[PDB]
Every structure is written in structure tokens, then in C-alpha cells.
Amino acid sequence: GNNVVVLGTQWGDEGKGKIVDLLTERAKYVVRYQGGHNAGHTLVINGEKTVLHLIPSGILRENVTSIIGNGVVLSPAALMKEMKELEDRGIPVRERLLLSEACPLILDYHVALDNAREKARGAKAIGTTGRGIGPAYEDKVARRGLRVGDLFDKETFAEKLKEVMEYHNFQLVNYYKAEAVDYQKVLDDTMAVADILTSMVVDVSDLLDQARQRGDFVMFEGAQGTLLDIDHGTYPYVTSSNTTAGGVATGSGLGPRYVDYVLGILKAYSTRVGAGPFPTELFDETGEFLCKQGNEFGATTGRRRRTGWLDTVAVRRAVQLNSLSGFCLTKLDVLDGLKEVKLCVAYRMPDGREVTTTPLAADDWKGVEPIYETMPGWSESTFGVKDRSGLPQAALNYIKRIEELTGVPIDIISTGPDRTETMILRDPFDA
Amino acid sequence: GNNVVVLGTQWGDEGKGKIVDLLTERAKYVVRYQGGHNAGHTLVINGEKTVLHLIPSGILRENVTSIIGNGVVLSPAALMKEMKELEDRGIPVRERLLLSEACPLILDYHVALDNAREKARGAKAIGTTGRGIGPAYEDKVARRGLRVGDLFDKETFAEKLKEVMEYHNFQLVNYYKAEAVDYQKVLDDTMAVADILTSMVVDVSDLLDQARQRGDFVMFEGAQGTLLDIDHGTYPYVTSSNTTAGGVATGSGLGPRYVDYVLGILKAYSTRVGAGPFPTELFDETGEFLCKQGNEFGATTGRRRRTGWLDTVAVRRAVQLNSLSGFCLTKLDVLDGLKEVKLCVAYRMPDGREVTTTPLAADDWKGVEPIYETMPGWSESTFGVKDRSGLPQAALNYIKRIEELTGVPIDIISTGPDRTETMILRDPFDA
């Protein structure tokens, strides 16, 4: 499996961080293809703990080439920040990173817009991440936006910037009645990093085609969870962009038929940060237990943290949307100690009918009741275990049912944070 | 391939209509996955000539189910017009067409807005086809739009429509200084058809996955040319939609690993409507010859198509973006009677640089001169030939040269309009 795609299969927070780092060991190119500066790859770099949201984690390895495809909305300020920070620790970023000329630019007015659309709602706020991502994609399809390739013609850029800023400033001062954004400041700020940005521009789609013909190992990294997909998720409690492995081709330029293996990161139980359907949410002591054990008090990304059992109906949808090839199971150890474990196998609709596939977004998720398949828990601690024999038969049967209920094999089991605390049953790259 | 994707490989006007129609003889499901009511499929229904812009041509066959994927922006008005006309001619549309709940709605204000923008730039475009498509994509990415799924809950729809119309009218009148669109009208107009629409809604993703594992033949039809793709085409001379096969997974919900064969319609020479880079354009007797022989007259926003030699550098980009399986060659006969034929195999840059891959969009496309390979033309007529024996050796040599320069086989040769004037060297559904 030369071209591998790695993405969370639920609503984010599955634990894609450790796994990504792991595959970086054999991958020669690491490619971001969707979203923006919201990757959330927390890591310990040169002693201290830091977070990379835009630049891939592969920037840390010697002979790995990190790429930001056109699908990513590019914020120069965010890029500049992470660059500086990494250069500080002695990482030669400028020589290990490449950009697509087609990446859309997120500039000051975009953050302003997001921030105004959040506070304009007020009571009925959405819990927008307000990073300017949405407004950048908006200008792109509207075709008044700017991309990295515009920085090659500095005059034209200045002219294009004025027209877009006139339009957005108008909306800002008059409609949202917020502050205006100074054109010259935005112009000077960008013109300052222009040369740096253009120097990392490469024909990414041809590069990836050449890597394909040579059989180079390429990994595509997805930023957010599947069910948060703008088209196919739990609309409207969804995200500002596509999140499924279906965005790989459009977002990178690689042909659709060349995706070899798609790895779904699957957490042993479910969590959702924020509002939205969650048929399997618990409001009792087990919920509390899981929340506590999972040490997910809002540990990385959020204004909420709802716990609940694994939902195979929803995972089955992720399987289908992403044509998953295999799963990597994370956080199994959170279930260590339970007397009885459960997995939702179907939903009972508000009108009495039972379903094995997620209902339409327009259907009544507010009245779905999950049907659970109850099964034996285990007491032996499975944390840090690195062999099958180290997993109590109850846990093995749990793993076994998941594969039977989804039709996708569990090729890797992450039993802890260290690289050595992993069980690779198949390896995406050799498959 | 069980799952086939058919699309134009150049700048449009490649002539896919006849091929799409031929393929629907075998396909069990026909799927639209991108664009809006701009398909321009000219055909002959129940004895009369018609044009279908939104409903797939597959609606004409009893064994076929036509599906309009989420990737398509749907105008309810356009839909109603096409359905009625079809029903009139005796084609029971309502029982053969399905829709996704996630198709964005194009409403009266999207059209007004699209128009306002044209007015604001220049009056010299009889905006009639595809109006509103762009603004609809905008609202969707901004998460403030309406989807078919929203028509289930009437109360909610009304408040949602009220909020977005409030926003757009502010633009219309204050910014564009144009007229506002009436709420009550749109709300009512949209209510008259609401149940007609939601009754055709289905779980498209599940359906396609079911067809996939059952092994039914599914054909996806793309509606524009590859090089006009919003991310990958000749920016800024591109459409607002993605036009490459990578849009299939996202616009229909089919898993990415499930695209089997990608058929690219290739015209034997090139045409381009409007403005933008066209390195192989002709300004001579030959140019006018290809236009007159090819009947390349006005039908694209009031204009004659610009003509030129087949450009294999530009075609190799398409092969790569779409991961093409094979070509369907059209209009070879337009070259009948020329004394020599040329194929462009490389580009000479203004800086004397000679490249065989298309340069970035941010490159000096005006200083590009094409490097041609000339070869003997042929005097024999190749129109309607149905077997390779009826074709002259000089033609077989041209055909052969294209496959050599591109790397992809020419699997179908359409030599005329009748379904019999076709040489199927491979059949996409077997391969």
C-alpha cells in the first residue's frame, strides 16, 4: 500500500497523533490535503511540549518531505508562527516543506469576518472555531479570493487585494458594524513573507505522480473527524470543510484511483465535543467513569466532552464514506475494569422501525434510541500491552465483534503513548 | 470496471453526449456528482429534440435509475421545468429519479446576486444558463445555505430562509444598489414544490455502496472539461466547480477506493471558448478549416470556439488529475483532407526552457510556444467508419502517437453521431 490515508473515523479526538508519527518512520512524503491551521498535532519537540496545527509532524524527520496541498486554506501568519517556533529548536523548515500554488490565503479580514459572524449570532452562537477558514473557502468558490500563486505577480496581487478588501470592509462596517481592516497593513504583512512562500512552491500534483511511479511511500493526513464532514456529516453540527478520504484527490491533485489504503483511527468508546446528535451518549456513572479514565476533560480541543459507547452504526457509515481498509484501535484501556461492555448495533427510530445505517440528517436523530449488544468486561489492565497474549480473552472478543460488525479488520492496536506500545498486525504500507 | 466515470479531458466541447448515451445502455445507475443545471445534454425524447441540463439522459431508459448527488447545486425551478417537459412527452420521471438530501438549493436570490455581479463588471453576457450556481456553492461553504433536506421541516425552513434572504438583500440593495428579492415569493415558490422534491430523496450513499457490493453497473457523469477545474485548471480561467474525477467521492458519497475506470473524452484537436491560455491555438487557414469542418460555431455564451492542434502536454495533465483509464476519441474526421497533422509534445518557455509537463498557472503562459511533431494527413474519409480497417494507415498512426505520448489507450473511437458509428476496442464495463 504505497499511498496511505490516515483519518479519524468518529467526531474527532480519536488519537490520530501517535499513529501519524509512527507511519512517518517509513513515509517519504507526508501530505495535508484539507482543512486549515486546525490540525492539533500536540507533541514534545526538543524537551518542551508544543502544538502544530498547519505544518505536518513529518517536518521533524530528516529525509521526509512535508507538503501542503491546494485543498488546505493557507494562513501566512499561522505558517510564519510555527516556522519561527520550529526554526528556534533548530529544525530546517524551509528545506523540508513544499506548498501548492493553488492554496487559498486566509488574511486578516477573514478572521475578522469569522469573529463577527460568531458574535453577531450571540445567544445562538454555533461554537465556531473562528479561524477564518470558512471565509477563505467562500472567497475561493466565489472567485474573488487569492491563492499562493498570486504572490508571483506582486502588482496584480496588490490590485486584487484592494477589490476584495473593499467588499469585505463594506460588509464589516455596515452589516456586522464591526471594525474595518487596513488594506496597507494586510498588504505590507503579506509582501513581507511573499518571497519566503513562493520559494516553497512546487508542482505538487506532478511530484505525487512521480512518487507514485517510483513506488515511494506517501501518507495523506486528515485534520478532522469523518462525521464532521460538511456534506456527509451530522448536518448542521458539522465542520467548515470536507473531512473524508474522498477529499484526497481534489485536495492534493493525485488521481482518485491511486489511493491504496485508507486507515481509520478508531477510539474504543465515543466522544463528541460540542452540540449535535450522539445516539449513544451516557449520562450516568459509566459515562462519568469513561470521561475520567479517558482523561478527556477537554484535554486537547474543546468546549465540551460527552462520553458514550462505541457506535457501530455510525462507524459503518465512516467505513462506507471513506472505503476504509483497516482500523487502528485506540484507548482500549479506558474500558479496563468494567464488568459489562456495550456496543450499539442498531437504532430504534422514533416511529418504531429499527435501522442498521445512520438515518438521514433531516430525519429525527432527537428520538433515536440505540440497541446495544451487551458483553463481558475484563479486569486485567491492558495498558502498555504489546502482544496478543497480553490481552484478556474478553478484550479479544470485543475486538473480534467490532470487525464482525463493520466488516473492516483492526490492523493496529495502540495500547499506550510510547511508540513501542503498539501492535501492528498488518502495517498499511506493506499491505 | 463496474463503476465508470465519464468526463471531458480538455476545455469542454469534447463531445461526451453521444458516449454518455451509449454507456447508459449498460449502466444500471447513472449519477450526476458536480455542477448545476448546465449539462447541456441535447437529445431526442419520444421523437422530439430536447436539451437536458439537470436530469441525466438515463431518465429515458426503463432499467436505469438516475441519481442527482449531493455535489450538484439544485435549482427547484429548473428541475420542475425539466420534469414536466419529460412527463409531457410520456417519460414517468418521478419514479426513475432520486436525490440526495444534501444538494444545496439555488433560489431566486442566488440568481439576482450572480446577475448583480455581472452588472457590476460589464453588460455583455446574456446570463441564462447556470445562473446562481456560484452563489449557491458560496452559501454552502459558509454554512448559511439551504439543502433539500431542509424542506422536510416547513417551520424551520421559513426561519432559515428569512435569515439568509435578510443577509443577501442587504448586499443586493446597499452594496450592489440593485433590487431586493421578495421573501414571500421565494418561500411560496419553494413551498409549491417542497413535497414533490422530498418524495424523491434517498440515502444515495448507502444505495451506491449496496450497488457496489451487489456488482451493479454504475456510471458517473461529469459536466465540464478537466482544465477548467477550479483548483487545478488554468486559473483564473476556470469554472467555479471542480471538474475532475476526484469530485466523484465527495459529490456522491461513494468511497474513493471504489472508482474502477475513468473514461476521458478527447477531441482529436482542441477548442476553447472565451479567454485564457491556449498554447496550440491556430490563426490560419488550418484554424478556420478545423472550425468549419468541426462545426465549431456559437453555442457558448454567444461565440465561435477558438481552435488549435491537439496538445499532448495539456492532455497529460488531465491523465494525471483524473487517473485516466482510457480515452474515447471524437471528431477524428475533422482532420480528413489535411496534408499534414501536428501534435504538440512540449512547451518552450519564454526563458528558453523546454518543458513536457504543463507549467504552473502562475507561469508566463503567454510566452509559451508549442513544440510540434508533424505527420502525414489523409485524404480518405473517416466519417462513420465502424472498424479499424476502414481507417487509413495515417490515421492509425496519429491514434497510435497519441497513446504513446500520453500513456493511456484509446478504448473507443466515435466516428459519427449514430450509435453504430462507434468502435469499442475495450468497453469500460468489462475493463
Curated annotation (Swiss-Prot), chains A, B:
GO molecular function: adenylosuccinate synthase activity; GTP binding; guanosine tetraphosphate binding; magnesium ion binding
Cofactor note: Binds 1 Mg(2+) ion per subunit.
GO BP of this protein: 'de novo' AMP biosynthetic process; adenosine biosynthetic process; DNA damage response; IMP metabolic process; nucleobase-containing small molecule interconversion; purine nucleotide biosynthetic process
Pathway the protein takes part in: Purine metabolism; AMP biosynthesis via de novo pathway; AMP from IMP: step 1/2
Residues engaged in binding GTP: 12-18, 40-42, 305, 331-333, 414-416
EC identifiers of the protein: 6.3.4.4
SMART domains: Adenylsucc_synt (SM00788)
Binding locations of IMP: 13-16, 38-41, 129, 143, 224, 239, 303
Consequence recorded when altering residue 140 to I: Total loss of activity
Keywords: Cytoplasm, GTP-binding, Ligase, Magnesium, Metal-binding, Nucleotide-binding, Purine biosynthesis
Coiled-coil positions: none
Signal peptide from the UniProt entry: none
Reported effect, residue 17 to V: Significant reduction in activity
Annotated residues for binding of substrate: 299-305
Similarity comment text for this entry: Belongs to the adenylosuccinate synthetase family.
Function: Plays an important role in the de novo pathway of purine nucleotide biosynthesis. Catalyzes the first committed step in the biosynthesis of AMP from IMP.
Protein name, UniProt field: Adenylosuccinate synthetase
